[PDB]
Ligand binder design. Sequence first.
Ligand SMILES: Nc1ncnc2c1ncn2[C@@H]1C[C@@H]2COP(=O)(O)O[C@@H]3[C@@H](COP(=O)(O)O[C@H]2[C@H]1F)C[C@@H](n1cnc2c(N)ncnc21)[C@@H]3F
Lengths: 182, 181, 74
Amino acid sequence: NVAHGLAWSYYIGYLRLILPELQARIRTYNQHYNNVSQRLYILLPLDCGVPDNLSMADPNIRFLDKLPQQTGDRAGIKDRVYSNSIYELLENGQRAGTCVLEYATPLQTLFAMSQYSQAGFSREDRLEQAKLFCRTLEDILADAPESQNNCRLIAYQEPADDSSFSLSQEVLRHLRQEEKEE
Amino acid sequence: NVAHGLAWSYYIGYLRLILPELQARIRTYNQHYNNLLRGAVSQRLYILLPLDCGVPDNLSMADPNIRFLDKLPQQTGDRAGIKDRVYSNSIYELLENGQRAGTCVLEYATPLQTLFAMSQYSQAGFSREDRLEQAKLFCRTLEDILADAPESQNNCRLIAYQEFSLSQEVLRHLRQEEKEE
Amino acid sequence: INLKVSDGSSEIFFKIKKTTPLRRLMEAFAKRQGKEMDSLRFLYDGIRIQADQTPEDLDMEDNDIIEAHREQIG
Ligand SMILES: Nc1ncnc2c1ncn2[C@@H]1C[C@@H]2COP(=O)(O)O[C@@H]3[C@@H](COP(=O)(O)O[C@H]2[C@H]1F)C[C@@H](n1cnc2c(N)ncnc21)[C@@H]3F
């Protein structure tokens, strides 16, 4: 089904390529600016609503800098570029954590397919496939080597209540758990 | 099914983003790089669709008569929390008897490579006939999507083929485009 | 229900039930042209038709036209 293809493409076309080199790029960044935050944190909103600008989605998530980029040829395109963004996670104006953070882009394809009538894809389909995308991706990474397991999948539902929701707290909670399990 | 999702992924995640901006990048290139892509024919994105999903990463490896000249200026955009995610495209010359017979922006449709890799990695398995059918379904779904994207779709051309000179395959498409003008 | 298929150089009318899959028509029309069903692209309401779809599935009406274009891929 749809989710199965998108999850394999996420591994084959991205994670398998960047996770092995991620550690070096973080070190290179640290020395510049005079020196848990070494994993790639991947947001997976299960409703597939994926904003492009993290800072405008949550005030307490603020862009810090980009890692050095990585490049590689693929499918006749010379020097495809892989870039990743560092964010600070705040609480009441105070830096509470720092990590490389992004959304799982293929969830935007699932969302768009549920919006374009030509795709023949309902909202219920999107929500099911989103969950299947997460489980397949989790299965794939569970069979991956150590050099490809240095990422954290963060899957979540936003409340159907009018109650507010903190994306920053959703990430910080996992940062805190990881510190504890050290 | 799989091919349906991959075609929508190819459109939603790539073509709808880069096609509306392609002419501006080509103008910028021509103006600061000697009008190398002259005429509408040389200003479309040519997408290769090998229906056997054989997608080498190096086009010169696929055909010596396809040779890399330069890269267009990069497009950047904020994308799913990544600041300045980068989209880049490569310019190739096509050779016929040692001389430059054509110049175009050329590349493979990457999801076809994905289909092939899935036959190797996928645990549930993916047979040859299934892969060839999903490759065809990807191409036809992409055709259908582009037909319903009138705003941006005339910035590209699909080159599908079964296996032979890839360079000639491309040149034939280019010559036909010039004749239809 | 009555329907018609047109490629511009020829036209063939068909009469079938509403629950009969359109596989038969698309194969019938293409056979006349000397081409197999796959090499042609059939359209109704601007949408590519699939072999297992019936006029009831596509909400067809009597005396509709079906467009037959040369499929460029494959
Ligand atoms: N640099 C990156 N940064 C962040 N994430 C990335 C990056 N690269 C890959 N990913 C991951 C892996 C997924 C599958 O990648 P793929 O190349 O196998 O399939 C792509 C299609 C779906 O794209 P998307 O929805 O973004 O899903 C991506 C994203 F989740 C569209 C098209 N395409 C997209 N971008 C380019 C490009 N720059 N050049 C040429 N073709 C491109 C390809 F067919």
